[PDB]
Amino acid sequence: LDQQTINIIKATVPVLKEHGVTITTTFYKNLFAKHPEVRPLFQPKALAMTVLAAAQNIENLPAILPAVKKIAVKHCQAGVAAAHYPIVGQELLGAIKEVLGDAATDDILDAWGKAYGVIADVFIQVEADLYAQAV
């Protein structure tokens, strides 16, 4: 939620987007290898790139609501839980570090974790509301 964090996301997103294919493939490979328990829920190739896109609009998250709402329904149909969020975040950050190489400073990583946390929260809330609206 901090401006420096915001500045670092703004500065780095473009660099990450240039390596989209690698982030996407590394993320899936690790997610499935390390967390076999999520395999039954499933590839949406856009999952990771959508996070970056949300991050690119961090100052105007409300603008991405219409997309967030459509994905949320799919997540609620599949059984996605708030406890899944951190696991996906962990694997995304790992993919990001691999791509950044040297340039992966602890401050950049920490920024991306904070950023992911915020974006994950919107999804978690919207989804908690849909599951509740279900009864």
Active site residues: 85, 127
Q: Could you tell me which of 109, 65, 61, 120 has the C-alpha nearest to residue 87? A: 120
Binding mask 43-82 for its own copies (x = CB under 8 A): -----------------x-xx-xx----------------
> Considering CB distances under 5 to 8 angstroms, the limit depending on partner class, which of ligand HEM, its own copies, none binds residue 84?
ligand HEM
CA gap 31, 33 in Å, rounded: 6
With contact defined as beta carbons under 8 Å apart, do 96 and 18 qualify?
no
CA gap 109, 105 in Å, rounded: 6
> Considering CB distances under 5 to 8 angstroms, the limit depending on partner class, which of ligand HEM, its own copies, none binds residue 1?
its own copies
CA count, 13 A, side-chain hemisphere, 44: 13
Residues that bind ligand HEM (CB under 6 A): 38, 41-42, 44, 46-47, 50-51, 71, 74-75, 77-78, 80, 84-85, 88, 119-120, 123
**Token pair in block for residue 127:** 């989804």
> Considering CB distances under 5 to 8 angstroms, the limit depending on partner class, which of its own copies, ligand HEM, none binds residue 129?
its own copies
Number of H helices, E strands in the chain: 6, 0
Report the interface residues with its own copies, using CB under 8 A: 1, 3, 60, 62-63, 65-66, 121-122, 124-126, 129, 133
